[PDB]
Amino acid sequence: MKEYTFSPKDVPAMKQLLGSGNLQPGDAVVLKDGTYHNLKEINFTGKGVSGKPIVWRAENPGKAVISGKLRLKIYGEYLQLEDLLFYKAWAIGHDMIDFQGEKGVYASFCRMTRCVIDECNDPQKGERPNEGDEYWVGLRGTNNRIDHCYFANKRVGGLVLQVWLSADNHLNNHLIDHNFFGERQPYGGNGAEIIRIGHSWSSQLESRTIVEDNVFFRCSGENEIISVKSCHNVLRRNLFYESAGGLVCRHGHYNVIESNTFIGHNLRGTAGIRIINQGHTVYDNYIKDVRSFGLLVRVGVYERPTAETDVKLEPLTSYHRVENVDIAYNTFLNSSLELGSGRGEKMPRNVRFAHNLFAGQTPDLKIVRADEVLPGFLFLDNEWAFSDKKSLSSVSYEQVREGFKPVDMPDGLNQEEKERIDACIFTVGPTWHKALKENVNHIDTNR
Ligand SMILES: [Ca+2]
């Protein structure tokens, strides 16, 4: 096993070695302290093996800085980037860092860990809608991992992290864990998501991406923090803090949403979970002080397509009926329930809303097209805890009244929140980046 060391004056030789395919398992490409400007088109390829990846890393964590024009493609097996700081770099074209070489030649078992992407905005792209688009990280292939990274201050349109699916490469089992997705200011239009899993056109395909133990801090570009657009993904134990958007099951089916926590601080645009499409299981989520919606269950325009469906007549970009969704053991604290809104004639069917706590000061419960929507819900053994003890009796729908029991405000909620936040923030991100430590300390001291 060999270490190959380079300095900023050696960018040409560095790019050649990384892109040659000649690196062997256990080898490392090591960058001495400095700023590496304008790498431009750079490939990282090779074949590591399990337990012996090929590594591209800083000699001293955080002191190798990559800036300027960049088009990095990663493809091969068991390749790892570690401890790199991407600062004021930007994409030559659409994609700054991509896990594919030529179309069809993918990364697998590759990993980006303890890296930062901060302020990586093309000066020649604009900050307003339609003034330019660039994506920071594109996942392709299978079994790749993004972990313990910090991504913040994207100011141009486009995704922080896109999971790309195709008809012949969709089932990925990628893992996105222990990352800190920091501030994103309002974009003023669509296309400023943090994570997008698939696309409308790939949304009927199984992805099996796992998004676990991540922090989203002031992610406020648009109404979707995470836009789930594919099937069988798992979103677990994430923290959404002061973020002006929601976790949205936008397209695709059978997504599993477990034990996430939302701390909105009553800020503009903060939201919880938005449900479109079928088959999801939504368990143990805790949604607090969000102002747009706590839970939204939408009508659909079309049924889920079959092989016979002409998707030119029933587009995948539309909205598909909610059916067969289990919503159990969640908490909605000073956060609304909005059931049956949206355009379309496909009412929700077979939605179970059971064992949830709906609590706060004044309840915010919105039911649309009640006599057509409520038959599609089973409300069972929920708890209702609000200041006015007459409030449940004032609800117009007996089926709703019978599905809730009034209770006094439970006394363990502050401790429950502390456990959830403590579990998410003290193992997140790269420890060497001061802004990660500062932002984590902010959450810790402003719960
Ligand atoms: Ca969007």
220 CA from centroid of ligand 1 (Å): 11
Query: How many other C-beta atoms lie within 10 A of the C-beta of residue 104?
Result: 11
245 CA from centroid of ligand 1 (Å): 10
Residue list, CB under 5 A from ion ligand 1 = 190, 224
Cα(227)–Cα(322) distance, rounded to whole angstroms? Answer: 16
Which of 436, 444, 432 is CA-nearest to residue 33? 432
Experimental method: X-ray
Asked whether 271 and 241 are in contact (CB, 8 A), the reply is no
250 CA from centroid of ligand 1 (Å): 9
Asked whether 146 and 112 are in contact (CB, 8 A), the reply is yes
185 CA from centroid of ligand 1 (Å): 14
162 CA from centroid of ligand 1 (Å): 12
Q: Quote the domain boundaries for residue 35.
A: 1-447
How many domains does the chain contain in total? 1
Which of 49, 42, 41 is CA-nearest to residue 23? 49
Resolution in A: 1.3
Which residue pairs, CB below 8 angstroms and at least 24 apart, start in 417-422?
Answer: 417/261, 417/263, 417/286, 417/288, 417/447, 418/447, 420/239, 420/259, 420/261, 420/286, 421/239, 421/261, 421/263, 421/447
Dihedral sign for Cα atoms in the order 15, 19, 22, 25? positive
Q: Tokens at residue 102, please?
A: 């030529």
Which of 152, 150, 164, 149 is CA-nearest to residue 73? 164
331 CA from centroid of ligand 1 (Å): 26
Residues 6+ apart with CB under 8 A from 153: 118, 119, 121, 182, 183, 184
Q: Tokens at residue 22, please?
A: 């000649």
Whether 190 has a binding-site annotation, put simply, is: yes
Whether 222 has a binding-site annotation, put simply, is: yes
The residue assigned the tokens 């659409």 is 94
* Residue 361: Cβ-neighbour burial (10 angstroms; 0-12, 13-18, 19+): exposed
Whether 193 has a binding-site annotation, put simply, is: yes
Cα(295)–Cα(287) distance, rounded to whole angstroms? Answer: 9
